[PDB]
Design a protein around this nucleic acid. Structure first.
Lengths: 60, 227, 51, 143, 254, 70
RNA sequence: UUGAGAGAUACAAUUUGGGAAGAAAUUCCCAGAGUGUGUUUCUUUUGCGUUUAACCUGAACAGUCUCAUCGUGGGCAUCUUGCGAUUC
């Protein structure tokens, strides 16, 4: 149901398909990099938010 | 006795027999530019070392289209000691021209010394950040190979490829992730460099990591699109 | 190559036959090689030649 | 000292032989190959036989993917089974050179440790709980 | 093999041997049934007085409670004797547990002979099994009726340059002793003839004895199960069922 | 020209298959491939008592029926 | 017993492409892919609890004197039978 729809959306949004030893990767459209800044590196800047919300700061 | 098998790419052969190797035809018979092995079948073949050099590390990994043919003119950037440059000269034969660029003087002496006996190699001792300095020596080139271990490899290849490379020519670049961020997985750095080449204008065709020959090294092959 | 060789090699250069037969048969090594014909080693006498 | 020199010379011989054999043998590539494809339809229609224009049995071979146009001899030289056996024997010889070299390395390390105990200094026997015997020298400067 | 089991000649020989043992008092003294295997070629393995266990899948020859058992141990004997006496698994299992030094001190000559009279089964530590021929005497070892078996009691593995720690495992001990009692054994020799006990006259039926014979043939002739099995080379020319005093009755004539 | 017949080009396919078999005969064997891979990786990167040899024949086989309470 | 994601993964059905045979029906070979179930690892999120530990360092082996090395004698064959390594 919802999980199947999420799986279908993930398969549609996937841009890398492996074929045996080879793995085909999609070249992204040239419009997106022109119209927007590159997407943020999620973990590295999430370290800062975890540090700011660390438990040693009793933050309620 | 040994058999010579024609490799997919032109000018490259495989020795077959008791021991199997990758070989190229020798331009100067009876001489070895460094300590590589020679096999006489007559015609003499020098033995490539894929652990020593990165271009036919990519060939052994199975690159599709090398952009290096006996007719073509090649611009080699980062030509230390001329060891791989001798085999590129062997591939392009007497007709083709290899312009080998090196900055450092200590490999520069031996690059000059090897280009002394090899006619088709045009040695350049000049920094690769500045293509305008050796613009007298270069005409147009069919392919650009890069072996520089620099952070701004994409910028250097952009500057050289905009100025010397023909339309629809080839770019073959060797990327090490250690001279880049090197604290993330090497795949991330390789994706960044592919995106940089796309920004420059080089439309990439393929990417091949060079295990077991080098660690965290890839060969990215692409095509220049001036339009 | 001669620059990249250490001093212990340069002392015994030219005495490879005696050097490697001694190293393979657990005997005493040569004290000197081609450098025996330098003028200073000639001025040295006795045990001072190896020094 | 003479014993250590002998073992060192043997290790250096084996190391040079290992280097020569490694240059003599070729090694098969095991590396990721990725192909950049512009369109998602061409992605879904990607087949390595049609892209490389080669035979399906020659797809998995990486070193010499010959095209169908280029394709369009175990006998002679040597029989195939014996030839494969001799190639494996060459690889085994290189591995045996490596094993002899590391064995001689461990022997030489032990000899050099004892030869350091023979010298002049103040040293302390340190016995690990695992049972390894180590020696630590005093903080004192060589005169 | 299968033809040897399915041949009615073997069964008729078994009734003939049983009837002859019943009729003849000299054969009535005997109580065990042996087969004499004619291996095609010479075995080529020197006799070493070490019994090798032949498994019997279908039936059990003996239960360990039935026999009188002597255990001979290495001689810090307190640990082995105390563990086997105190543990309930092996408390009643052994009629007597003795060390090799105590056995040498106590039993000599006629005392050894009455020991052989008393005890039916002898098992020992594999570390003292080689010392046993001088201690037990020759009159244990001749004839191979009561050759001492080899049991390993600690279950630890001896490694080079290191000690082997001494324990006693009563579960492992009773498992090995149960296998010894339920299974038959052979000792290799150099020539072609071999003798294997397959059944006991009173306690076993004729199909049981025939099945034991079939299992013995398969275990000895099978190419696998090396080195305990697979010792017969060149096939079996003929088997001969006989007791200790009875003549050989041929089966599986090839 | 690209206009080869369907009855044609079977000779081309047969020649391609023969050349492919002749080339692939040089490469290796399936059984030796694993051993070569293990040796290349190494290059690039019952009871026994040694005092008593008679234990291995003299040992009684142990079974789950033997290790059972009964 | 926090969710998610990814990889390895056996088996089951289901499919892609190359080639061959076959009149076709189909079959075989090679190269795969996805899905279902099962197995397993890693990453990260969330809840709860700990919320400090590890390591190095100062004059830190040594009167029952300590240690190294070459020897010598003996014990352990019911076995530490002893490696140019350290058996007691």
């Amino acid at each position: 149901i919802k999980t199947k729809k999420r799986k279908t959306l993930k398969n549609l949004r996937k841009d890398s398909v492996k074929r045996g030893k080879f793995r085909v990767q999609l070249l992204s459209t040239t419009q997106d990099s022109k119209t927007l800044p590159p997407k943020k590196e999620s973990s590295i800047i999430r370290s800062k938010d975890r540090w700011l919300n660390r438990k040693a700061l009793n933050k309620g | 006795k040994v058999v010579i098998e024609p490799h997919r790419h032109a000018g490259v052969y495989i020795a077959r027999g008791k021991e199997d190797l990758l070989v190229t035809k020798n331009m100067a018979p009876g001489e070895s530019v460094y300590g590589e092995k020679r096999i006489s079948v007559k015609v003499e073949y020098r033995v490539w070392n894929p652990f020593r050099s990165k271009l036919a590390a990519g060939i052994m990994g199975g690159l599709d289209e090398l952009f290096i043919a006996p007719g073509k003119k090649v611009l080699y950037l980062g030509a230390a000691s001329g060891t791989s440059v001798s085999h590129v000269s062997d591939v392009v034969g007497p007709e083709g021209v290899v312009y080998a660029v090196e900055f450092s003087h200590r490999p520069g002496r031996e690059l000059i010394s090897m280009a002394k006996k090899r006619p088709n190699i045009i040695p350049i001792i000049e920094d690769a950040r500045h293509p305008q300095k050796y613009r007298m020596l270069i005409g147009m080139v069919d392919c650009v190979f890069a072996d520089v271990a620099q952070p701004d490899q994409a910028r250097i290849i952009a500057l050289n490829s905009h100025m010397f490379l023909k339309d629809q020519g080839g770019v073959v670049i060797s990327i090490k992730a250690n001279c880049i961020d090197s604290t993330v997985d090497a795949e991330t750095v390789f994706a960044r460099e592919v995106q940089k080449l796309r920004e420059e204008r080089i439309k990439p065709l393929e990417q091949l990591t060079l295990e077991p020959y080098e660690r965290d090294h890839c060969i990215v092959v692409g095509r220049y699109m001036r339009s | 190559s001669l620059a990249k060789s250490p001093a212990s090699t340069i002392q015994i250069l030219g005495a490879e036959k005696a050097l490697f037969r001694a190293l393979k048969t657990k005997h005493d090594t040569p004290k000197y090689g081609l450098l025996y014909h330098a003028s200073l080693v000639g001025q040295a006498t006795g045990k001072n030649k190896g020094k | 000292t003479q014993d250590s020199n002998y073992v060192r010379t043997l290790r250096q011989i084996e190391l040079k032989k290992l280097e020569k054999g490694a240059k003599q043998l070729m090694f098969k590539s095991s590396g990721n190959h990725t192909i950049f494809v512009d369109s998602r339809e061409k992605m879904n229609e990607f087949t390595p036989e049609k892209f490389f224009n080669t035979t399906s049995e020659m797809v998995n071979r990486s070193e010499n993917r010959l095209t169908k146009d280029q394709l369009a001899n175990a006998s002679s030289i040597m029989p195939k089974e014996s030839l494969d056996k001799k190639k494996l024997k060459k690889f085994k010889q290189v591995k045996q050179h490596l094993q002899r070299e590391t064995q001689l390395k461990q022997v030489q390390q032990r000899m050099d440790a004892q030869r350091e105990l023979l010298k002049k200094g103040s040293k302390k026997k340190i016995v690990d709980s695992s049972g390894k015997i180590s020696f630590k020298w005093k903080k004192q400067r060589k005169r | 093999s299968n033809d040897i089991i399915k041949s009615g000649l073997a069964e008729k020989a078994l009734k003939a041997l049983i009837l002859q043992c019943e009729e003849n008092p000299s054969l009535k003294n005997d109580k065990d049934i042996h087969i004499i295997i004619n291996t095609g070629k010479k075995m080529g393995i020197n006799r070493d007085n070490i019994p090798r266990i032949i498994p019997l899948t279908k039936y059990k020859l003996f239960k360990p409670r039935d026999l009188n058992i002597l255990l001979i141990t290495k001689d810090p004997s307190a640990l082995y004797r105390e563990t086997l006496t105190k543990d309930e698994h092996t408390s009643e299992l052994f009629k007597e547990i003795i060390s090799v030094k105590n056995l040498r001190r106590r039993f000599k000559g006629s005392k050894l002979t009455q020991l052989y009279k008393d005890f039916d089964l002898v098992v020992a530590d594999y570390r003292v099994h080689h010392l046993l021929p001088e201690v037990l005497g020759s009159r244990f070892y001749h004839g191979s009726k009561k050759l001492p078996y080899m049991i390993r009691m600690s279950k630890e593995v001896k490694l080079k340059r290191q000690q082997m720690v001494e324990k006693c495992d009563p579960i492992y001990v009773r498992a090995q002793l149960r296998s010894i009692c339920k299974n038959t054994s052979y000792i290799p020799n150099n020539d072609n003839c071999l003798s294997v006990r397959v059944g006991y006259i009173q306690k076993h039926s004729i199909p049981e004895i025939l099945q034991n014979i079939q299992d013995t043939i398969n275990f000895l002739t099978d190419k696998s199960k090396r080195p305990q099995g697979g010792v017969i080379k060149g096939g079996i020319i003929s088997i001969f069922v006989k007791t200790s005093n009875s003549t050989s009755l041929p089966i599986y004539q090839f | 020209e690209g206009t080869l017949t369907d009855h044609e080009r079977k000779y081309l396919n047969k020649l391609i298959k023969r050349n492919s078999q002749n080339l692939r005969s040089w490469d290796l064997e399936e059984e030796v491939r694993d051993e070569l891979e293990d040796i290349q990786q190494s290059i690039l990167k019952f009871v026994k008592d040694h005092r008593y040899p008679g234990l291995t024949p003299g040992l009684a086989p142990v079974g789950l029926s033997d290790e059972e309470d009964s």
